[PDB]
């Protein structure tokens with residue numbers, strides 16, 4: 019299965035943190051990275067009084083079940099990051115899509131519950147998967163077209 023993972027951090031110098039997370043993602047069992055988006059410098063969603071975020075998207079090939087993947091992303095977050103509601107964030111890993119699967123459990127909502135509202139998630143994803151279609155038939159290209167989210171600056 020191809021899972022799409024969003025990465026975020028707003029450490030002041032987040033490159034080492036993001037690279038460590040990227041290596042950790044590739045080290046997940048039965049999984050490997052297919053593609054990584056560019057790194058993007060995005061203004062904070064929430065209070066203006068904090069550093070910019072580094073956001074990126076990762077295409078991860080995996081044979082793990084989706085809840086097993088979440089266990090690994092949550093582990094990586096605990097091992098590589100620290101700390102609230104509107105930031106700042108040491109390191110966040112969001113499962114945006116998991117193949118074509120729809121998941122609504124206590125722990126896991128796939129597609130990600132709010133990605134449709136977040137240009138810092140949609141634009142990095144569109145870079146690496148411009149033709150992406152969501153399980154319900156929505157098109158990533160159309161969401162960006164409908165909402166006219168500001169394009170992002172690279173890191």
Ligand SMILES: CC1(C)Nc2nc(N)[nH]c(=O)c2N=C1C(=O)NCCN1CC[C@@H](SC[C@H]2O[C@@H](n3cnc4c(N)ncnc43)[C@H](O)[C@@H]2O)C[C@@H]1C(=O)O
Nearest residue numbers: 026060061062063071104105110112113125126127130138
């Ligand atoms: C401050 C803010 C708003 N401002 C930003 N501004 C810019 N510019 N850039 C940013 O990146 C940025 N970040 C922001 C930010 O707050 N980041 C948090 C994003 N993530 C982190 C992972 C999960 S943590 C909580 C539960 O979610 C459950 N959960 C359910 N479904 C899923 C799923 N599909 N994947 C992972 N966890 C899932 C688990 O069970 C967990 O217990 C959800 C959270 C979110 O999205 O609310």
